């Protein structure tokens, strides 16, 4: 019975996932000046046209978007990956201060919240077999941080008043995620792991430069969101981050000059 509190956080993981403590965690500092421009990089290619959103689910973690991975609909390759990844669920880390609340840092920057795309590769089956084998996930990370609003994401925004305990879904059908990503593509790769136990090392993180702009009034929304299912005592839902953890013998892939 794990957490982000005092007693239960990320301090007190590696007590039941000893890989807390292993060779390829996440999230990182992503260090610029260090990172390596990889003219092997392949362009990334995102493939979102027949996306298919479902549902949108309060996990007393996070919320996920969830979609339908049966077929080819919505897939990541390019860049470093080889193969197809397809696109399974959506969600966001994010702070109860502005100032912090994303997972990956930039030169130490914390932005105040990160959206990530997780994809599973294709050869692998399903998502379950995936998150078994080093190569079988693929995360896109999008920094957020507070400005205008971003209009894409005010669909999302609008239906956590109906999600906002744990274990409470809602249908989210025709949602486009399209409307989430920034105008360029650059980006930073580095191998890692899930940010939340069982923490397992099967992901090729893909963590963009540029930023999206939400508003305060977008990611306040986000903090009105509980841990707690309903009848149980208030948790607000903040601050749901992994802070960063140490490079170990890895080397971070810039895709721009
Ligand atoms: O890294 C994250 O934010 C956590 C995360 C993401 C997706 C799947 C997960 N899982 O435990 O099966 C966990
Ligand atoms: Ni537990
Ligand atoms: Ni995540």
């Not at 609909?73 to 470093?80: D, E, M, N, Q, T």
């Amino acid at each position: 019975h794990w957490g982000y509190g005092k007693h239960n956080g990320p301090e007190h993981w590696h007590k039941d996932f000893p890989i807390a403590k292993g060779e390829r965690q996440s999230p990182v500092d992503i260090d610029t000046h260090t990172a390596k421009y990889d003219p092997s990089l392949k362009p990334l290619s995102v493939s979102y046209d027949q996306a298919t959103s479902l549902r949108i689910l309060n996990n007393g973690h996070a919320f996920n978007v969830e979609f339908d991975d049966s077929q080819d609909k919505a897939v990541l390759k390019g860049g470093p990956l080889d193969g197809t990844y397809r696109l399974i669920q959506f969600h966001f880390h994010w702070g109860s201060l502005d100032g912090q609340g994303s997972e990956h840092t930039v030169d130490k920057k914390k932005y105040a919240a990160e959206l990530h795309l997780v994809h599973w590769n294709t050869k692998y089956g399903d998502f379950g077999k995936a998150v078994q084998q080093p190569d079988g996930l693929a995360v896109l990370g999008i920094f957020l941080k507070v400005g205008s609003a971003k209009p894409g994401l005010q669909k999302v925004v609008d239906v956590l008043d109906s999600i906002k305990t744990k274990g409470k879904s809602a249908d989210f059908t025709n949602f486009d995620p399209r409307g989430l990503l920034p105008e360029s593509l650059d980006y930073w790769t580095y191998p890692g792991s899930l940010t939340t136990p069982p923490l397992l090392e099967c992901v090729t993180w893909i963590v963009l430069k540029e930023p999206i702009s939400v508003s305060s009034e977008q990611v306040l929304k986000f903090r009105k969101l509980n841990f707690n299912g309903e009848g149980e005592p208030e948790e607000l839902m903040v601050d749901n981050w992994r802070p960063a953890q140490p490079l170990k013998n890895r080397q971070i892939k810039a895709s721009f000059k």
